[PDB]
Design a binder for this molecule. Structure first.
Ligand code: SF4
Ligand SMILES: [Zn+2]
Ligand SMILES: [Zn+2]
Ligand SMILES: [Zn+2]
Lengths: 408, 760, 366
């Protein structure tokens, strides 16, 4: 199957920048197309990671009308009927040309059992309704209540069930008295029971143990037993002084001998007794003139800073070149430093590292070719940052090689 | 937690209690000091089963004289399993505290549906067919034929239990139905007959109502056990309904046609066995003349069918009349069958008292009273005699014979009502015959005679003034326990006001009124848009739920309810309801919203309980009145006017409110559970109907909440859920609605618990 | 309909003042703050999942819930990047049974607040999807390194949690993938969000007011403590110095940027790959190193040697120190707050200022 081709293509189309990259790498003779599309897995799971289950009113969401016998084109409705009623699935397997069309087929779909909730001999959905009745009788006879373990067993929730002979309420189920509207109302009851059972089973994909389980569940009380609180692992820090003076490096802090403490206490207790000259002592004017000389733009504390001399000469097309280059080298170093970090000491990962080495060397060749084709226009714009990144890739490759040869 | 309950230590199987708990424990110490019955009412907040089993085990641990055996009685088999496992928790606590010095035989017991092993009986789904095949594979005579041959059918379970199993009592192990089946698999036995044989050695036995109150099943707890027995009913609202279901008998034209076919089959059997054998018929005539049909009754384990449906004190000890020759007894049943068939032919509703039916008998087909009493004994002895195998085939005639017994025994309390057509039928060929009873007291009367102290207990019982006035009942304690709360825990609202200001009701008597059903659907829609995780919606009748969910479809409502939550409508299949319940409980846990709408009479709301997040907002639609039923209601009400003194409009309101507050008060499990519980029609505000809801719901029914609108009720629901979805941790309860070890010993707490509980 | 009877009067001159003072005092409340000497998750890839449901358009708040929620998330991104600098945020709007990664996991408030100012203008159609939103958050938060307390915050309103698959196997997976999910809920308690919160490890909360919802988001600003499960690794870090255009660009390295950019003369390098970054702190886009200026470690040192409680006493009570040790002012109210270690005197203004902003006692420094 040509799946991958169609994926990498669809992407290249939607993502022209990625297309660019794909050319700048594969077409540039640095690596091969298979590797690039191979290790570039980034997509969604499914159309929505699942579909929309038939919530309810799958016949009555936009009922019988993609605007009775109106248009029928809603995707949620047709997919929910495809899940919900597999008799309609098999009928869609049968009568789809082969001599009817979706107009006539869905016009014969809004018939009884499906939109009107009736029960009668009718058109082409009659055998489908008979198979649905056989599925109900298989759920009732070939199957039963699974969790009839300690509750919900409505057939045998009475230890002594007899016939209609020796009782009081013997006129419960009458073999006579079958009417038309009454049987229709019972049919509506059966169709809604089956509809909700198919919804719950479609949203659910394919002994004393269960009985004691249901008994011990229904007996217990949440009050009269144990509590509901998980844990909290106590973090009692050992050496919190490492937190107090943090990652700041040790400054040169050498306060001298404690004789200086006594000397300084003496001098500053004598100092702050006699106080407040305000006119005289505060500023000499020559110091203020030298301060204005300093804060003027050619003196000290004006660092000749905030200059930031730039090289805006040929902006736009060189910016496009650098967009292509940083995208390409980002993908290259993405693969390199993604496989690189842990050595992953086997032969498959080392072979992927060797393919990374080949892509690295040809990437350096393509980068030198792009620098020669770009920077020989007006002699500016150092591209040497990309060469720093690729030189560090070169360096980690040779340093890993010497490290693993020491680890031989 | 080691409670002092004013005489005794009690090991409570949780290291915390409620104050309601200890009030209940005081009052039950009071009921077991003086040997009297007592009716309690602990609401559904506490573990009333936990407390109840704790104190009965405290007495049985502390006093081996007055109380021999506890007979718990909970009504459905999952509640049997729940009470057994809470007893098993308490024994595990009891053995953690001391060590293996337990000896304590807890024991469940239900039936051959739930304790049979045999892989040819087991795939049968029905009770009578399991009873028939168990009567096939073991009996009094098939067991003997196997005993002197080899290839004749046998279970290998009952035979091996007969070989060794009736000399080793079950050592001190609390057994469920599953554990008891496993022990039956293990050594190779019948756990059914093991359970029945080990009734004699137990200390707590937990079976159903119909296994105690039926006179034709409960022949297995004798007098000497009952003189020191404590019986505890649980969930005992419909005790009177269980009694009226337990002694009334329904006859149908299909039953009489299959009785005629049965009569011809048994005639042919008498002919061919007259061609076969004669000597045991001589022994039959001996044990009729000599004894009172008790010759081969000593070895009678699986030869017992349903016994005589007269009560334990109204049976006789005489010789069965002109009945003795089985040819003449087939003529006797032939006469009785043809007269009841001719009586059923009447095409209008006819009420009679049973002496009028006996006089119509004794005049027009010459059958007197005492040979009509002994018909049950005669058909049981005859049907034991003729070696016949599958007794399910003989279900109608036994019914008819048992019906004969009731007609020839009771009078002035019971009523024979003939219906040519039912109420929802009219003019379809179903003529049926209710021998209906309306004395509730005549079925619990031997339960109060034999037993020491029976304890009716439920979460809802209201009012307590009427259960002595129906059951011929005089208790020691008539107690109601008030819901003491540190957090509102519930709010009942009476949404009796439509959004158009239409009076919400069900006055139309199930014949649809359109705008009221519209406002019901609007209530369900907007309450769906507010409430989380499962809404339970009880209607009035299945015809009315049928009609309502019909007219929620033609009217454009029900798709919107689908948009908010997932419906699971009810049906009267036994298996479809269980599947709808299972999907309803798998939709309250897999993210979405689920809403179960049912009928407030059926089995959906009897056992199947809705716990912390399965029903948040129990929407009681309508006031549940028994409206479909016949003159059985009119006749039971005429009886309660006449011979008891309880009014018409009093008993109807009592019955409607016990069903409504029965179906509402299941939503709450503990103090840390919150249930919105709305009542939707105006009648619940009218003083007498509100006056018969229990006290623990009237306490939290505010006059502002009384007769809310739909949208005012929706805003009260929103404020309720927002104020009651916050962290309500255990530390908010140790003051008010919880008690520690050392919070009990303070006498101020004792003054508080004196103030909580009240009596009536 | 008769609230007008709420105003009583005994002397009626100061009694209406007493009723108004009781009402104005009952219209306010104080916060509940918790202290711990426990391990915290300080590198913290948090990931915000907002509803875009139908129930976002409901008007329980003073504007509709979308607008208020989005305003407090703008405040949340602001205070979270103001307090935890290493960490990151990603925003998913969950809309129409599908999940949409609206803003990817990054560490600068400009893109997130720009996207929220965009996301005011949305529609909020359909039912949410907790499955797909937790799936996208898991899909990105698989491969963050193990020492990161990977956290998801679901601001969740509606009740029908319309998933397309089973969401207990996600909770088992996210339990095993040591992620931590906390849900702030609107209008209700939902059992599935309760199971998700109590099983993944998070905390579930439901909203009364504006003020309570601000208290909940302020509760989720601070780094929540770690379980017994999360890895305690040692991430390799890089501390690049700032580099201006060296000596009036005498042999400089003129670059564009590394993530509409101008010609960068100088700035921040990297000590691993030697690239060119304008802003610090930024995770290395082509190496995997994390780059830290190191006051960005000092901006979150108060979590590790934390504060203590102030002994709060209202009455007069032995106070021979009449003036505030905070700012040298008299104590004209009946609230005096005294520290634990030094036991000096502080007023209410110094209380709120020390416990919210300065994060240290001024006495204990001396
Ligand atoms: S004798 Fe035992 S094994 Fe045989 S059918 Fe009866 S219960 Fe089952
Ligand atoms: Zn780098
Ligand atoms: Zn201090
Ligand atoms: Zn101050």
């Amino acid at each position: 199957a040509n799946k991958e081709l169609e994926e990498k293509n669809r992407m290249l189309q939607e993502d022209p920048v990625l297309f660019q990259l794909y050319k700048d790498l594969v077409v540039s003779q640095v690596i091969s197309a298979e590797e690039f599309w191979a290790n570039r897995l980034x997509x969604x799971x499914x159309x929505x990671x699942x579909x929309x289950x038939x919530x309810x009113x799958x016949x009555x969401x936009x009922x019988x009308x993609x605007x009775x016998x109106x248009x029928x084109x809603x995707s949620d409705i047709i997919e929910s009927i495809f899940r919900t009623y597999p008799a309609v699935k098999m009928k869609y397997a049968e009568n789809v040309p082969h001599n009817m069309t979706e107009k006539e087929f869905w016009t014969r779909f809004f018939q009884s059992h499906y939109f009107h909730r009736x029960x009668x001999x009718x058109x082409x959905x009659x055998x489908x309704x008979x198979x649905x009745x056989x599925x109900x009788x298989x759920x009732x006879x070939x199957x039963x209540x699974x969790x009839x373990x300690x509750x919900x067993x409505x057939x045998x929730x009475x230890x002594x069930x007899x016939x209609x002979x020796x009782x009081x309420x013997x006129x419960x189920x009458x073999x006579x008295x079958x009417x038309x509207x009454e049987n229709s109302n019972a049919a509506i009851i059966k169709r809604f029971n089956h509809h909700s059972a198919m919804v719950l089973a479609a949203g659910l994909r394919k002994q004393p143990a269960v009985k004691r389980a249901k008994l011990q569940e229904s007996i217990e009380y949440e009050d009269l037993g144990x509590x509901x609180x998980x844990x909290x692992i106590a973090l009692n820090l050992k050496k919190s002084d490492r937190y107090y003076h943090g990652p700041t490096p040790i400054x040169x802090x050498x306060x001298x001998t404690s004789q200086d403490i006594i000397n300084s206490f003496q001098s500053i207790r004598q100092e702050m007794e006699a106080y407040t000259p305000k006119l005289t002592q505060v500023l000499s004017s020559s110091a203020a003139s030298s301060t204005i000389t300093a804060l003027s733009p050619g003196g000290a504390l004006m660092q000749x800073x905030x200059x930031x001399x730039x090289x805006x000469x040929v902006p736009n097309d060189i910016q496009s070149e650098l967009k292509h280059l940083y995208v390409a080298v980002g993908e290259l170093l993405r693969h390199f430093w993604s496989c690189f970090x842990x050595x992953x000491x086997x032969x498959x990962x080392x072979x992927x590292x060797x393919x990374x080495x080949x892509x690295x060397x040809x990437x350096x060749x393509x980068x030198x070719x792009x620098x020669x084709x770009x920077x020989x226009x007006x002699x500016x714009x150092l591209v040497s940052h990309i060469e720093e990144m690729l030189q560090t890739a070169y360096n980690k490759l040779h340093t890993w090689x010497x490290x693993x040869x020491x680890x031989x | 937690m080691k409670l002092n309950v004013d005489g005794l230590l009690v090991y409570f199987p949780y290291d915390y209690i409620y104050p309601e708990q200890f009030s209940y424990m005081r009052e039950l110490k009071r009921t077991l000091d003086a040997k009297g019955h007592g009716v309690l009412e602990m609401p559904s907040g506490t573990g009333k089963t936990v407390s109840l089993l704790a104190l009965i085990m405290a007495y049985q641990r502390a006093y081996p004289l007055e109380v021999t055996k506890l007979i718990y009685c909970s009504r459905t088999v999952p509640e049997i399993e729940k009470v057994i496992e809470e007893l098993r928790k308490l024994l595990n606590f009891y053995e953690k505290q001391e060590g293996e010095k337990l000896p304590f035989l807890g024991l469940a017991l239900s039936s051959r549906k739930n304790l049979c092993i045999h892989p040819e009986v087991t795939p049968l789904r029905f009770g009578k067919d399991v009873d028939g095949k168990c009567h096939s594979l073991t009996a009094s005579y098939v067991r003997a034929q196997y005993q002197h041959d080899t290839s004749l059918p046998h279970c290998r379970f009952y035979e091996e239990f007969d070989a060794h199993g009736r000399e080793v009592p079950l050592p001190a192990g609390i057994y469920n139905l599953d554990d008891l089946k496993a022990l039956g698999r293990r050594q190779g036995w019948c756990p059914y007959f093991l359970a029945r044989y080990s009734i004699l050695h137990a200390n707590v036995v937990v079976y159903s109502y119909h296994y105690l109150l039926d006179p034709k099943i409960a022949d297995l707890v004798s007098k000497e056990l009952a003189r020191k027995a404590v019986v505890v009913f649980d969930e005992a609202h419909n005790i009177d309904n269980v009694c009226i279901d337990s002694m009334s008998v329904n006859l149908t034209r299909r039953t009489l046609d299959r009785c005629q076919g049965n009569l011809e089959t048994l005639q042919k059997t008498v002919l061919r066995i007259k061609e076969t054998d004669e000597q045991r018929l001589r022994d039959e005539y001996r044990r009729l003349v000599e004894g009172x049909x008790x010759x081969x009754x000593x070895x009678x384990x699986x030869x017992x069918x349903x016994x005589x449906x007269x009560x334990x004190x109204x049976x006789x000890x005489x010789v069965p009349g002109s009945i003795r020759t089985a040819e003449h007894f087939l003529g006797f049943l032939r006469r009785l069958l043809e007269y009841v068939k001719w009586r059923l032919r009447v095409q209008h509703v006819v009420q009679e008292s049973p002496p009028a039916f006996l006089s119509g008998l004794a005049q027009r087909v010459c059958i007197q009273r005492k040979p009509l009493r002994f018909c049950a004994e005669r058909l049981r002895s005859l049907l034991h005699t003729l070696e016949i195998t599958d007794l399910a085939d003989f279900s109608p005639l036994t019914l008819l014979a048992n019906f004969a017994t009731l007609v020839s025994t009771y009078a002035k309390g019971f009523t024979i009502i003939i219906e040519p057509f039912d109420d929802r039928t009219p003019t379809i060929a179903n003529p049926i015959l209710h021998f209906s009873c309306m004395d509730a007291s005549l079925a619990i009367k031997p339960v109060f005679e034999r037993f020491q102290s029976v304890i009716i207990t439920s979460g809802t019982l209201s009012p307590l003034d009427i259960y002595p006035k129906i059951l011929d009942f005089h208790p020691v304690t008539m107690a109601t326990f008030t819901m003491t709360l540190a957090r509102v825990c519930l709010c009942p609202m009476i949404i009796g006001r439509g959004n158009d200001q239409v009076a919400i009701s069900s006055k139309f008597e199930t014949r649809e009124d359109i705008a009221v059903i519209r406002n019901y659907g609007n209530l369900l829609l907007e309450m769906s848009a507010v409430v989380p995780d499962g809404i339970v919606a009880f209607f009035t009748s299945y015809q009315y739920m049928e009609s309502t969910v019909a007219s929620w479809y033609e009217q454009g409502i029900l798709e919107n309810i689908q948009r908010n939550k997932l419906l699971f409508i009810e049906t009267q299949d036994g298996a479809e309801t269980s599947v709808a319940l299972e999907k309803y409980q798998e939709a309250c846990e897999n993210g979405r919203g689920a809403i179960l709408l049912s009928v407030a009479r059926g089995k959906v709301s009897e056992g199947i309980d809705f716990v912390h997040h399965y029903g948040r907002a129990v929407i009681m639609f309508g006031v549940p009145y028994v409206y479909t039923q016949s003159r059985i209601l009119k006749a039971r009400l005429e009886y309660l006017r006449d011979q008891f003194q309880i009014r018409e409009n009093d008993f109807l309101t009592f019955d409607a409110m016990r069903h409504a507050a029965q179906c509402v008060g299941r939503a709450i499990r503990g103090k840390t559970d919150y249930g919105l519980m709305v009542f939707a029609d105006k009648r619940f505000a009218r003083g007498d109907k509100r006056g018969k809801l229990p006290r623990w719901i009237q306490e939290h029914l505010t006059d502002a909440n009384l007769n809310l609108t739909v949208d005012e009720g929706v805003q009260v629901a929103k404020y309720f859920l927002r104020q009651m979805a916050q962290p309500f941790h255990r530390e908010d309860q140790l003051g008010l609605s919880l008690l520690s070890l050392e919070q009990l010993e303070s006498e101020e707490t004792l003054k508080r618990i004196e103030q909580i509980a009240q009596q009536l | 309909x008769x609230x007008x009877x709420x105003x009583x009067x005994x002397x009626x001159x100061x009694x209406x003042x007493x009723x108004x003072x009781x009402x104005x005092x009952x219209x306010x409340x104080x916060x509940x703050x918790x202290x711990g000497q426990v391990r915290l998750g300080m590198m913290r890839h948090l990931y915000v999942v907002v509803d875009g449901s139908r129930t976002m358009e409901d008007q329980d708040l003073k504007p509709n819930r979308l607008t208020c929620t989005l305003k407090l998330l703008e405040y949340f991104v602001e205070e979270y990047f103001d307090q935890n600098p290493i960490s990151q945020i990603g925003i998913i709007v969950t809309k129409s049974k599908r999940a949409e990664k609206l803003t990817e996991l990054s560490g600068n408030p400009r893109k997130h607040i720009t996207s929220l100012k965009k996301a005011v203008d949305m529609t909020c159609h359909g039912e949410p999807s907790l499955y797909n939103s937790l799936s996208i958050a898991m899909q990105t938060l698989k491969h963050m390194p193990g020492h990161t307390s990977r956290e998801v915050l679901i601001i969740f309103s509606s009740l029908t949690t319309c998933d397309p698959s089973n969401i207990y196997d996600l909770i088992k997976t996210l339990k095993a993938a040591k992620i931590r999910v906390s849900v702030i809920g609107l209008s209700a308690e939902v059992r599935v969000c309760t199971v998700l919160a109590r099983e993944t490890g998070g905390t579930y909360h439901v909203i009364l007011d504006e003020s309570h919802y601000k208290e909940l988001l302020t509760h989720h600003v601070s780094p929540p403590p770690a379980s017994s499960s999360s890895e305690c690794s040692l991430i390799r870090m890089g501390f690049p110095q700032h580099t201006i255009x060296x000596x009036x660009x005498x042999x400089x390295x003129x670059x564009x940027x590394x993530x509409x950019x101008x010609x960068x003369x100088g700035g921040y390098f990297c000590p691993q790959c030697r690239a060119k970054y304008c802003e610090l702190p930024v995770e290395c886009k082509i190496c995997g190193l994390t780059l830290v200026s190191a006051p960005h470690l000092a901006r979150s040192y108060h979590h590790l040697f934390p504060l203590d409680a102030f002994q709060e006493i209202p009455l007069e009570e032995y106070n021979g120190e009449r003036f505030c040790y905070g700012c040298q002012g008299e104590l004209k109210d009946q609230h005096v707050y005294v520290c634990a270690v030094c036991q000096n005197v502080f007023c209410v203004d110094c209380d709120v200022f020390v416990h919210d902003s300065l994060h240290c006692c001024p006495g204990c420094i001396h």
